C-alpha cells in the first residue's frame, strides 16, 4: 500500500512513493527472470514511469543534483527494458493482427511472429544479465541508501523539500488539470498527432499526481475525479497506442527483405497499417465530444470537492 | 427501343433482340474508337452478354449450329473487350483505392495507375485494330443477314421457334424466378463464394428475361418485379464485384518485382486486399436478410400478376 502522511513535509512523502515504487520494481524482478508473464515489466515500468514522472513535476524535493541522477538512472532502466517490452506486445497481439487480414495474407506473419519470439528470447537474456550486473545492482542500493535519508535537503537549494504535502498537492493538482483543460481548448479541428500526444502525456501527470496523492483526500473525491477522467485518457491513450503500432510497422516497412519473401510479408503488414490508421481516424473522430465532456461544471465541481480547505 | 410482338413467333422476337442489341453496339464502335469515355465499352459489352444470355436460355429457338455459331462469335467479340474494360475499371477505381490507404502507402500507387494508363492506350490500340479488321466486319455482316432471315427454321431442329411468345416468357421467366428462390433457400449459415456467385448468375437471366420480355407486360407490373429485385441483385453484384477485385489484386500481388520498389506497391495492394475483403465480409453478412425479403409473399403475388393468363 502507498500511505501518505497528510501532515509531513513533501520530502517526506516523495520518499514514501519511491520507497514503494522501487519495492515493486524489486518485487517484479523474479516473475521477469523466470518470464512468467508480461505484466511483470509492465508493473517494473509502471514504477519507474510514475517514479520519473513525479520527480518531474515536483522538481526542488530534492537537490538539483540528486534529482538529475535519479532521473537518469531510472531512464537508463526503463531503456533497458524497452526492447524486451516490445517482443511482449506485438507477441500479445498476434491474434488481433492476423484476424483483421485475409486468409491469404496471414500466412507471411507466421516467419514474422517466429522472428518477433526469437527477438524475446535474445532480448530476455541481455535483459535478465543486466539484472543481475552490478551497474544495475549498484544503482538500486544507491537509490535505496539515498531515498532512506530522511534528513531535509539545503533549503536554498531544494525549495520545495521542507513544503506542506497538502498545499503542493493542490497546487501541483491545479496546475496539472489546468494545463490539461487549456491545452485541450487550443486544440481546434485540426486535431493534429502533436495535439494529441501533448494532451496524452498532461493527462497522464495529472493522473499520477492523482494516485500519488490520492490517501489525503476522501477515497470518494479521488475515485470520482479518477473516473471523471478516465475516457478522456482512454481515447488519447489508444490514439498514441495506434500511432506506436503504425511507426513499428512503417519501420519494419522500411527493413523488409528485397525478395518474393518480403513482397508476401509487405502486403501482410500493409494490410496492418491501412486498418490501423482506419481505427486511429475514428479514436480522432471521437476526441472532440470526450473533451467537451471532460471540460464541464461537474469537472471543476468534483476539482473542488477533492481539494477542499487545501 | 425494344418493342415486341405480343402474338409473334418466339423466332420472331428473339431476332428483334438481337437486331436491337446488334445496333447498340454497333452505334458504341465511334465513342469505343474515339475513346470518349468507359461507357461506350460498358454498352457494348452489356449487348453482348445479354445476346448470349438470352440465346442460352431460349436453346431451341434456332438451329443448333446457327445457335453455337452466334454464340462463339458473341464470346470471341466480349473477350476482345476484357483487358480495355478492366483497364477502365481500375483507372476509375483511383480515387476511391487512394482513398483507402494511409498517406504513406499512396505513393506507391502513382507508378501502379501510370502503368494501368500505359496499358490502357494498348489496349485501346489492339481493340480498334479488331474493330476495323475483317474478322469482326465479316462476322457482324453474318450475324445481320442471319437474324434478318424471317424463315421458320426446321421445327425438328429447333422446336422453340413457332412458339407463342407469350407462353415462352411466362415459363421461361418462372423456370429463372423458382431457380433463384430454391438455390437462395439451399445457401444455409456458410454463404460461401460458390453459392452467391451462382446466385448472382441466375438474378442475372432473370432479370435478361424480365428486361426482354417487359414489352408484353403492363409496364407497372414489370418495374415493379424489377424493383422487388433491385436489392438482392446489388447485394449479389457488389460481393462478386468486390471478389473480381482482390483476384485482381492478388494476381498482382504475385507478379509484383521481388525488389524495394516492390516492397512498397506490396504495402499498398495489401491495404487495398484488407480494406476490399473487409467490405465483402459487412455484404455476406447482409446477404441472408436480403434474400429473406425477397422470398416473400409479396414477390410471389407481383410475379402472378406479371404473368396473369399466360
Known sequence: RLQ????????????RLLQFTTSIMEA???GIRKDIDSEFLHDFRVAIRRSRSILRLLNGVFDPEKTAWMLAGLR??????NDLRDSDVYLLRREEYTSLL????????????????????????????YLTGREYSGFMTSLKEFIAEGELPDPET????????????????RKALKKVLVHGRRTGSETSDAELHELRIDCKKLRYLLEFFASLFPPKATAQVLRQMKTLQDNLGTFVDLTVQMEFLQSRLETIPA????????????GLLTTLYRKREKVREHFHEIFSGFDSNE????????????
Open 102 to 129: 485475409p486468409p491469404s495474407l496471414r500466412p507471411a506473419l507466421d516467419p514474422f511472429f517466429s522472428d518477433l519470439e526469437a527477438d524475446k528470447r535474445l532480448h530476455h537474456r541481455q535483459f535478465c544479465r
Open 259 to 270: 525478395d518474393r519473401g518480403g513482397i508476401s510479408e509487405a502486403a501482410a503488414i500493409g
Open 4 to 15: 501518505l502522511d497528510a501532515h509531513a513535509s513533501i520530502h517526506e512523502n516523495v520518499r
Open 28 to 30: 517484479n524482478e523474479e
Open 158 to 173: 531544494a525549495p520545495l523539500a521542507a513544503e506542506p504535502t497538502g498545499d503542493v498537492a493542490a497546487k501541483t493538482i
Open 76 to 81: 537508463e532502466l526503463g531503456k533497458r527494458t
Open 299 to 310: 469537472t471543476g465541481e468534483l476539482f473542488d470537492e477533492l481539494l477542499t480547505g487545501l
